[PDB]
Amino acid sequence: DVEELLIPKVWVPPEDPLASPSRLAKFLRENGYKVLQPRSLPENEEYETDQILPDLAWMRQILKPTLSLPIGDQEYFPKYYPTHRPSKEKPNAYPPDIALLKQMIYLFLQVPEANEGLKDEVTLLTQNIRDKAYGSGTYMGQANRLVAMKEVATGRNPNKDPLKLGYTFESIAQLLDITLPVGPPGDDKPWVPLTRVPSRMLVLTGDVDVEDYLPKINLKSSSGLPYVGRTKGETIGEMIAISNQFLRELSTLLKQGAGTKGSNKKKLLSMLSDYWYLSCGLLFPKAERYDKSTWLTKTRNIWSAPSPTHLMISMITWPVMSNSPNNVLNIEGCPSLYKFNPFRGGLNRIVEWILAPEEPKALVYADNIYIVHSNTWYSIDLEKGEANCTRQHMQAAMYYILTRGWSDNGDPMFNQTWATFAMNIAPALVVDSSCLIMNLQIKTYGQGSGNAATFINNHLLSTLVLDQWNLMRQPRPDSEEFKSIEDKLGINFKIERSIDDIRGKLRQLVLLAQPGYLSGGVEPEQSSPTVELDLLGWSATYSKDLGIYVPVLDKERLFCSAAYPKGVENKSLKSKVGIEQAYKVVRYEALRLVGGWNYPLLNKACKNNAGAARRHLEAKGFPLDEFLAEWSELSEFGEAFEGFNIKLTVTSESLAELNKPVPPKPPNVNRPVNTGGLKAVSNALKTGRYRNEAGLSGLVLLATARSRLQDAVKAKAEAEKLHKSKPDADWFERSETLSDLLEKADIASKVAHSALVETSDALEA
Ligand SMILES: [Mg+2]
Ligand SMILES: [Mg+2]
Ligand SMILES: [Mg+2]
Known part of the structure; x- marks a missing residue:
């Protein structure tokens, strides 16, 4: 017979059968996965920081004396061999x-x-x-995952450029007005326009020794090319320097123009090829709870963007996005769940939203669509999401961000260098470019799997699914009609979960709620019922003490976390025996807090284990209080408790305090708030007639996209010749007379050889 033990014997993973470049190269080629012609980049060499960044010299109080830049002669081929x-x-x-x-x-x-x-x-x-x-x-799992990405993008349901499907930058942007409301960069709103290099984004306000405008980046993630095996914190100076240089070289190429008889393409192609590495990510193997049976066939990848490329894209993206807390909870009609938090009365409000008679109705968060239809709750995911994303998808997203976020009442708050980078360079860097796995530079299909960087692109993809859903009269998600949306858009999706009779089940939670921390204020003998919504990983249970629905972490997720804790991850001179115990207090208490409190055995076992470590440290004299000062950073669940400034306790009081309803934050939209909902906008758009609500800046960005790369400064001017003549009244009749004006100046790029394609081909030469 079989053995089956109470405690399973230590697992020994299988040998990784793709641990060689030779072997990996074979696998990729065998599956028709594209392996690129290996590019090389200059060796990093020392240089005085005073010389490269003179303007940031005033760091003479409280920098690094020299910088390591890719300038020295002798090329090398980059290598990335991550540890599994x-x-x-x-x-x-x-x-x-x-x-x-x-x-x-x-x-x-x-x-x-x-x-x-x-x-x-x-x-x-x-x-x-x-x-x-x-x-x-494993490498075998990473490579294996990649072939799945290629299949999503070029196999069963090949990706479709949305613009060749009737969509335009503006019509997409009018959909994103509803599903992703955005404000201006800013409290008080004192932010600078996109017209300067990153170096000058620190301001020496008041002479004789600083205001910080640069987006925040986490100092512990890997720098990427050209600094393999170094962290962003170790390459901060370098990250700024390269971004400066790139953007300065770019603004020269546009200042110089396309020159006489196109005798400046060589100068453009030269530059883009020299900065090839800005379009190459490291295939970082993401650590999570994979199941053993697929240890060799599935490993999720993180596309580690080079720090300069991240910095520049997040300079466009972050100031708008960190200032737009606009969701379903503060704008009527809005399906977005952006910056949703289930605590502080947040979940109760979504459940009350569900219970409302209205249906069909949708909710969106990135690659997640939630739909209630015929009293059924549907949880939908895009297959690989990022894999479905084309460059035009991202440049549409870029168009939306610059239009509604970086524009004061029609007028552009951005110069032509940033306009050309956003529309024509950035998408080519990040979507359908390449990555470096071992010593092999191989193609990526669609966008690389970040998670912050990929948010807006995925959210856009789902927004199109939602538009398409409206156009065919909102079919039931499980139907054949709904499934035909992926054949029409080229976006893959699947129903992750569905709950029949959702309203009845939610209502019943009120009746069948057990005694617990949030009902009677006692240690639970029995688990209290929940509806497993998986609403951004959250479930719904009812609190009798508070009289409202309160969140509990999805049961599978909760027990998946409980079984395999995440590692400490680097522990230097900071103590020895104390740190191991201290992290366990964090681990066990945070488990209770997210939803362990609802599960009597898990709750009690965590409490005892945490209490055991707590007593041990307290007798040892460990500064546990000072340790837990920002426990939020130390826990894998810490994100949901950010800025909450609450202690790790998990008592009746702390749980009630965590859930006590607080009025939602006032919405911040740069334009008059739209409350019509998505359904209405979809029908107004299907007619073909719609107003250019982007203003001048939209016409500037249409010209920049639709003309040649080097003629970007001419493109703005020609779009301003159009703006001075008052018609606006219809976007299409406006868009076409602009395309003629670009043909009048011979700046309009040829079909299939657009400005975006030219930079894509230039990135691997
Ligand atoms: Mg979902
Ligand atoms: Mg996805
Ligand atoms: Mg996402």
């Missing part, structure tokens, strides 16, 4: 939480009699320990 953990030879990297499991089993045995509701917790945790494993996966 666990592995066959080093298997003990991330052990399952056996101490937790033993404690749960222990407490179950202490219970006088029976109870299978309790035992289900021990079963579920055990099943996770057996089936899954936390780690970096």
Whole structure:
């Protein structure tokens, strides 16, 4: 017979069968995955910081004396060999939480009699320990994942350029007005326009020794090319320097124009080729709880964008986005769940939204669509999302951000250097470009899987699915009619989950709510019922103490986290025996806080384990209070508790305080608030007639996109010749007379050889 143990024997991962460039290259070629002609880049060499950044010399109080820049002669080919953990030879990297499991089993045995509701917790945790494993996966899994990305983009349902499907930059931007309302960059709104290099984004206000405008980047993530094996914090100076140089070289090429008889293309192609590496990401293997059976066939990838490319794109993206908290909870008609938080009465409000008689109705967050239809809740995901994204998808997103975010009442708050970068360079850098895995520079299909960088592109993709959903009279998500939306758009999607009779099930939560922390203020004997909405990973349960619905983390997610904790990740001179225990207090208490409090055995076992570490440290004299000062950064669930300034306690009071309703933040939209909902906008757009609500800046961006790269400064001017003649009254009749004006100056680029394509081909020469 079979063995089956109470505690599974230490798992030994299989040998990675693609641990060689030779082997990997074979696999990619065998699947028709494209391997690029290897590009090389100059060796990094020292240079005085005073010389490269003279304007940032005043860092003489409280920089790094020299900088390492890709300037020295002798080219090298870049190499990225990430470590996979666990592995066959080093298997003990991330052990399952056996101490937790033993404690749960222990407490179950202490219970006088029976109870299978309790035992289900021990079963579920055990099943996770057996089936899954936390780690970096394998090269074989990464490569294998990539072939799936190519299949999404070029196989079953090949990607479609939205502009060749009737959509325009403006009509898309009018849809994003509803599904992603955006304001101006800013409290008080004192922000600078997109007209300067990153160096001058720090201002020496008041002479004789600083206002900070640069987007925030986390100092611990990898720098990327040209600094493999270095972090963003270690390359801050370098990141600015390269961005400066690139943007300065760009503004020269536009200042110089296209020259006589196009004798300046060489200068453009020269530059783009020299900065090829700005379009090459590192295939970082993402660490998560993969299941053992697919350890060799699925490993999620993070496309580590080079820091200059990130900095420049986030200079366009972040000042707008970190200042637009506009969602379903503060704008009527709005389906966006952007910056939604389930605490502070947040979840109750979504549940009340569901209970409302209205249907069909949709909610969006990036690559997530939630739909209630015929009293059924549908949770929908785009297949790989990023993989479906084309360059025109992103340049449409860029058009939207610059139009509604970086424009004062029609007027552009951006120069032509930033306009040309956003419309014609940035999408080519990040979508359908390349990545460096081992020593191999290989193509990426669609956008690379970031998670912050990919938000707006994915949200756009879903917005199109939503528009298309409206156009065919809002069919039931499971129907054939709904499924035909992916054949029409080239975007892959699938129903992740559906709950029949959603309103009845939600209502029943009020009746069947058990005693607990939020109902009677006691330690729960039994789990209180939930509806597993998976609303951004959150479920709904009812609180009798507060009289409202309160969030509990999705049950599978909760027990998936409980089974395999994330690693510490680097521990230098900072203590020794204290840190290991201290992290466990964080681990166990944070588990309770997100939803462990609802699950009697998990709640009690976590409480005991945390209390055990807490008492040990308290007798040892560890500064635990000072440690937990920003526990938010130390926990994998910390994001949801950011700026909340609340202690790790998980009591009746703390849980009630965490959920006590607070009025939603006032919306910040740069234009008069639209409250018509998406359904109406979809029909107004299908007619073909719609107003150019972008203003002048929209005509500037249409000219920049629709003409040649080097003739960008002429493009703005020709669009201003149009703006001075007052018609606006229809976008299409306006858009076509602009295309003629571009043909009158011979600046309009040839079909299939657009400004965006030319820079794509230039990036690998
Ligand atoms: Mg979803
Ligand atoms: Mg997706
Ligand atoms: Mg996303």
